[PDB]
Amino acid sequence: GSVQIVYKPVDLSKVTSKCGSLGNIHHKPGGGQVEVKSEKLDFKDRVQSKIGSLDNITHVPGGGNKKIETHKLTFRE
Amino acid sequence: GSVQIVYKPVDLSKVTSKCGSLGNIHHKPGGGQVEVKSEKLDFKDRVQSKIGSLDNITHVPGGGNKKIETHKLTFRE
Amino acid sequence: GSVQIVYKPVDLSKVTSKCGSLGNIHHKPGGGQVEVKSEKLDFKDRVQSKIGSLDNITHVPGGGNKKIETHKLTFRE
Amino acid sequence: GSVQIVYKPVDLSKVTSKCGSLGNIHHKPGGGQVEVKSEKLDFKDRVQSKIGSLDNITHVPGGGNKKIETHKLTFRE
Amino acid sequence: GSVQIVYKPVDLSKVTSKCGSLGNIHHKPGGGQVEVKSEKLDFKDRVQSKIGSLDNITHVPGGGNKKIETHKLTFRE
Amino acid sequence: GSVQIVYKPVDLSKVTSKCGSLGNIHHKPGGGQVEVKSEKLDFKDRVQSKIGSLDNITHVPGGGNKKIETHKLTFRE
């Protein structure tokens, strides 16, 4: 008996974002009101929690581009 | 018996973000009001918590670009 | 019996962010009001907590670019 | 000829405000956003103006009572 | 000819404000945002102006009481 | 001819403010943001102006009481 595996995922992918001018951006908010009333909080194993938040975000990238690329290979004899 | 594995994921991927000018960005907020009333907080094993927050963010990258790239290989005889 | 493994993930990936001028950025906030009322906090094993925060961020990188790249290889006979 | 005038407005008026306890008063506002854009302002002769205001008032008198009382007498021969 | 005038406005008016306890007063505001953009301001003759204001007031008199009382007499022969 | 005037406005007015305890007063504000942009300001003859102000007031009199009382008499022959 004999097993043989080859793995050659060749790739050449271009992500582009040609852009002129981003111009005038106004993020002008009049902050409201948040109330949270809890008693008990038991968190375990990869918990991500957000409890009571008033957050403002001006995310202005001059071109934002993500390439995600995973290669998995599991061998079980 | 004989097992043989080759692993050659070849890649050449370009991420680009040509940009002129980012211009005028105004992030002008009038901060609100946050109240949290808790009693007990038991956290364990990779907990990420945010309790009561009033946060303002001007994230202006002059071109932001992420390439994520994972290569995994698990061999089980 | 004989096992043989080769591992040659060759790569040449370019991340670029050509940019003119970042211009005028104004982050002008009128700070609000945060109240947190807790009693007990038991944290254990890789806890990240933020309790009661009023934070302001002007993150203006002149081009910010991240490349994440992990290579994993687990062999089990 | 002869003119004669008498003026005797007699009065005894009581204003009262018997009160126990004023208790818990909460004035908890999350301040908003006011913008005024003008060019020219010509004011004359007993002008009272308020231009662009974000004001908060906790007026808690422990009994507030006003008595206004005017006596006018104009004689024209 | 003969003119005769008498002026005897007699008065005995009591203003009262019996009160126990003023208690807990909370004036807790998260300050907002005011912008005024003008060019020209010509004021004359008893002008009262307020241009761009963010003001907070806790007026807690332990009993506030006003009595206004005017007596006018104009004689024209 | 003969003119005769008498002026005897007799008065005995009491203002009172009996009070126990003023208690707990909290004036806790998170200061906002005021911007005024003007060019020209020509004021004349009893002008009262307030331009751009962020003011906080805890006025807690232990009983505040005003009596205003004017007596006017104009004679024109």
Give the determination technique. cryo-EM
Q: What residues in E contact D57, CB-CB < 8 Å?
A: 56-57, 59
3-state secondary structure chain A: CEEEECCCCCECCCECCCEEECCCEEECCECCEEEEECCEEEEECCCEEEEEECCEEEECCCCEEEEEEEEEEEEEC
Using alpha carbons, select from D25, F4, F59 the residue that is nearest to residue E62: F59
Optimal mutation site among A58, A59, A68, A74, interface C, most CBs of chain C within 10 A: A58
F26 to E21: CB separation less than 8 angstroms, yes or no: no
Report the C-alpha gap between A11 and D73 in whole angstroms: 102
Q: Is there a contact between C55 and B34 (Cβ–Cβ < 8 Å)?
A: no
Report the C-alpha gap between A44 and A38 in whole angstroms: 18
Chain A neighbours, 3+ Cβ pairs < 8 A: B, C, D, E
3-state secondary structure chain B: CEEEECCCCCECCCECCCEEECCCEEECCECCEEEEECCEEEEECCCEEEEEECCEEEECCCCEEEEEEEEEEEEEC
Report the C-alpha gap between A3 and B77 in whole angstroms: 12
Using alpha carbons, select from E71, C7, D60, D32 the residue that is nearest to residue F24: D60
* Total beta-carbon pairs less than 8 A apart between chain D and chain E: 281
Optimal mutation site among E33, E34, E54, interface A, most CBs of chain A within 10 A: E33
Give the 3-state secondary structure of residue E21: strand
E77 to D77: CB separation less than 8 angstroms, yes or no: yes
Using alpha carbons, select from B73, C12, B6 the residue that is nearest to residue A11: C12
Q: Is there a contact between C59 and B62 (Cβ–Cβ < 8 Å)?
A: no
Q: What residues in B contact F33, CB-CB < 8 Å?
A: 30
Chain B neighbours, 3+ Cβ pairs < 8 A: A, C, D, E, F
Provide DSSP, F1-69: -EEEE-----B---B---EEE---EEE--B--EEEEE--EEEEESS-EEEEEE--EEEE--SSEEEEEE
Helices in E1-77 by DSSP H: which ranges?
none
F33 to C32: CB separation less than 8 angstroms, yes or no: no
Q: Is there a contact between E51 and F50 (Cβ–Cβ < 8 Å)?
A: yes
**Smallest CA–CA separation between F45 and chain E, in Å?**
5
3-state secondary structure D45-66: CCCEEEEEECCEEEECCCCEEE
Q: Is there a contact between E1 and D3 (Cβ–Cβ < 8 Å)?
A: no
C17 to A62: CB separation less than 8 angstroms, yes or no: yes
Report the C-alpha gap between A63 and A22 in whole angstroms: 10
Report the C-alpha gap between B67 and C69 in whole angstroms: 8
Q: Is there a contact between E50 and D47 (Cβ–Cβ < 8 Å)?
A: no
Q: What residues in C contact A71, CB-CB < 8 Å?
A: 9
Using alpha carbons, select from B10, C69, C12 the residue that is nearest to residue A6: B10
Provide DSSP, C11-35: B---B---EEE---EEE--B--EEE
Chain E neighbours, 3+ Cβ pairs < 8 A: A, B, C, D, F
Residue E41 has which token pair? Answer: 């301001």
Contact map slice: D 7-26 vs F, CB within 8 A: 22
